[PDB]
Design a protein around this ligand. Structure first.
Ligand SMILES: CC(C)(COP(=O)(O)OP(=O)(O)OC[C@H]1O[C@@H](n2cnc3c(N)ncnc32)[C@H](O)[C@@H]1OP(=O)(O)O)[C@@H](O)C(=O)NCCC(=O)NCCS
Ligand SMILES: CC(C)(COP(=O)(O)OP(=O)(O)OC[C@H]1O[C@@H](n2cnc3c(N)ncnc32)[C@H](O)[C@@H]1OP(=O)(O)O)[C@@H](O)C(=O)NCCC(=O)NCCS
Ligand SMILES: CC(C)(COP(=O)(O)OP(=O)(O)OC[C@H]1O[C@@H](n2cnc3c(N)ncnc32)[C@H](O)[C@@H]1OP(=O)(O)O)[C@@H](O)C(=O)NCCC(=O)NCCS
Ligand SMILES: CC(C)(COP(=O)(O)OP(=O)(O)OC[C@H]1O[C@@H](n2cnc3c(N)ncnc32)[C@H](O)[C@@H]1OP(=O)(O)O)[C@@H](O)C(=O)NCCC(=O)NCCS
Lengths: 142, 140, 142, 140
C-alpha cells in the first residue's frame, strides 16, 4: 500500500486502501520507523458522531492501525504477523474540526508482544486522547 | 436511522454522514441496563488485510455504550461522552456480522460503566470492550 | 500451597504463603474451577492506604492473583506457566471496612492468553471494583 | 514516613500500618507534573513463585499517581482517588528494586491522568501503568 502510505511489505493486499475503513475515513501515515510512527486525518463528517464531535472510535482506530502497521513494517519480513491484541484509549478533550494527529512511540518489543504509546493531538497541538496499544506478534499461518 | 435514541430535535450530523452510518452500525435493543447493536461486515469495516478492523469493534462499543447512556441522561440535562475505551481482541472476524451487547455494570453520578461483548455469526466471543462514560451537566 | 488455598500444583514453591504479599495481606481462595474462581480478604489496616480506604492496589492484587492462579490451576500440569500480562482495574465505590470478595469468571481461553473478568464486592454485595485480567500462557522454561 | 505529601494534620492510617508502608514504598521526588518512588524487593512484595507480584506494580503506581495529585489538589478543597488503573507487564522482577516514575499527561477538572513507568535495577522497562485519578470536592 502507498495510498494511505501504509508499509509496503507485500505485493498484494486483500483489500485496497480506498476501500478499507482507513481509506474510507482518510487515515494517512506520515513517518514510520521501528520505534516511532506518525499519522493524521482531516476531520470530516465521516469521522464524527451525530453530536458533531470526532467519534471516540475514530481515535481508537487511528491508534490501532498506526501501532499495528508500525509493527508490521518490521516483522512481516520476518515471517510474522501482527494484530492488535489490546487497545486502551482514554479521551481528554474533544475535537470538533481540523485534524487529528497521532504519534506512536514504541515502548516494548517482545517476541510475542510489542507495545506502543499513542498520542492523539488537535491542530493546536493539544493532547486530546491517548491509546495504549498492545500488539500480538506471531508467525503467519500462511 | 441507525436507530439511535431519539432525544433531540436536531443533531449536528445526519446518521448517514457520521462514522456510524458510514460503516453501518445499527442499534437493535435499548434499555437503561442493556443494549444491543450490530453491523454487516463490508470492506468499509475491514483493514487492508481483509479482517474487521480492530477500530471497528472499538467504535461499535463506543457508540453503543455512550448512546445507551444518553438515552437515559439526556432528558435529565446531562451530557454523556466516552472517557475510556478498553477493547481486547480474542478472535478475528473476516466476514458476516459483528454483534454487540452492552451490559451496564455501574451507573454513577459522573461515570457509567458498561461491559460490551462483540460476537461473530457463530456466536463466538471475538472481542470485549470496557466502556467508561463521563456524565456531565449539559452546557448551554 | 493451601495456606491461602492456592492451587497445589507443585511439591514446593519459592516463597511460602505467609511470606508472600498475598499471605501478608491475607488473601484466601474460596472456590476454584477452570472457568470460575473466588477469593476474599478481610479488610485491616494492611489493606488500606493512609486515608482509611482499601488501597486501590489491593483490589488490583486480589484480582491479579485470582485470575492468574486460576489459570495456573489448569495449565501447570500441562507444562505451561502463566503470568499476568495486563491488569485493568476500575474503581466504582470505596471500601472502608469488612471484606472484599472477588469473583473471577473466565471469558476466553486461548493458547497464549486467557482472559478473566473479575468482580470485587463489599459485604453488602455492592460492586466496588472490576478488573479485566489478561494472562499470558507459556511453556515453563524449566 | 514513605515521604507521602504532608497535606493534613491527621491521617486515619499510620504509614507503617498501611499497605504502602507494609511493602515498603517510598516517594522520592514530587512535583506537580512528575513524581518518583521506589521499593526494595522483599518477599512481602513477591508471589509464591518468587517474582514481584503483579499487584505490587499496580499498587506502586496507584499510590504514586494518586498521591502526586493529592499533593496539588488537597490544599484546594479537593479529594483525589484512583478511578482506573491499567498495568501492563513486560518483564518480571525477581529481586532488587522496583522504581516508578509518574509523568502527568492531563490535568482536568475532574480527572488527572498519569503515565507510570516501573523499572528494575538495570533500568529496564518491566511494567507500565496508565493511572486515571478522579478529582472531586472534598466531603465535609
Ligand atoms: C491475539 C491472538 C492472536 C492471540 O492468540 P490466542 O489468544 O492465544 O488465541 P488462539 O491462539 O488460541 O487462536 C484464536 C484465533 O486467533 C487466530 N490466530 C491465532 N494465531 C494466528 C496466526 N498465526 N495467524 C492467523 N490467525 C491466527 C485464529 O483465527 C485463531 O482461531 P483458530 O486457529 O482456532 O481457527 C488472537 O486472540 C487473535 O487473533 N485475536 C484477534 C485479533 C484481531 O482481530 N485484532 C483486529 C484485527 S487485526
Ligand atoms: C471515582 C468516583 C469518586 C466517581 O464518582 P461516581 O462514579 O460519579 O459515583 P458517585 O458519585 O455516584 O458515588 C459513588 C460512591 O463514591 C464515593 N464518592 C463519590 N464522590 C465522592 C466525594 N466527593 N467524596 C467521597 N466519596 C465520594 C462515595 O462512597 C459514593 O457513594 P455514596 O454517594 O452513597 O456516598 C467513585 O466511583 C469512587 O469513589 N470509586 C472508588 C475510588 C477508589 O476506591 N479508589 C481506591 C481508593 S483511593
Ligand atoms: C508476558 C510475557 C511472558 C510476554 O512475553 P513477551 O512480551 O513476548 O517478551 P519476551 O518473550 O521477549 O521475554 C521477556 C521476558 O519474559 C520472561 N519470560 C518470557 N517467556 C518466559 C517463560 N516461558 N518462562 C519464564 N519467563 C519467561 C523472561 O524473563 C524474558 O526475558 P529473557 O528471556 O530475555 O531473559 C513477558 O512480557 C513477561 O514475563 N512479563 C512479566 C509478567 C509479570 O511479571 N507479571 C507479574 C509476575 S507473575
Ligand atoms: C471526559 C471529560 C468531559 C472530563 O472532563 P475533565 O477531565 O475534568 O476536563 P475538563 O472539565 O477540564 O474540560 C476539558 C474539555 O472537555 C470538554 N468538557 C468538559 N466538561 C464538559 C461539559 N460539561 N460539556 C462539554 N464539554 C465539556 C471541554 O471541551 C473542555 O475544555 P474547555 O473547558 O476548555 O471547554 C473531558 O476529558 C472530555 O470531554 N474528553 C473528551 C471526550 C470525547 O471526546 N469522547 C469521544 C467523543 S464523545
Amino acid at each position: 500500500a502507498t495510498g494511505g502510505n501504509l508499509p509496503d511489505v507485500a505485493s498484494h493486499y486483500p483489500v485496497a486502501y480506498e476501500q478499507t475503513l482507513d481509506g474510507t475515513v482518510g487515515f494517512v501515515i506520515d513517518e514510520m520507523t521501528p520505534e516511532r510512527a506518525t499519522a493524521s486525518v482531516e476531520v470530516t463528517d465521516t469521522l464524527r458522531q451525530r453530536w458533531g464531535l470526532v467519534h471516540g472510535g475514530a481515535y481508537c482506530a487511528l491508534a490501532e492501525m498506526l501501532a499495528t502497521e508500525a509493527t508490521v513494517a518490521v516483522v512481516h519480513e520476518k515471517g510474522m504477523m501482527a494484530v492488535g491484541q489490546s487497545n486502551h484509549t482514554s479521551f481528554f478533550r474533544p475535537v470538533k474540526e481540523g485534524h487529528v494527529r497521532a504519534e506512536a512511540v514504541r515502548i516494548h518489543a517482545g517476541s510475542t508482544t510489542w507495545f506502543w504509546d499513542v498520542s492523539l493531538r488537535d491542530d493546536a497541538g493539544r493532547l486530546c486522547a491517548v491509546s495504549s496499544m498492545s500488539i500480538a506478534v506471531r508467525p503467519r499461518r500462511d
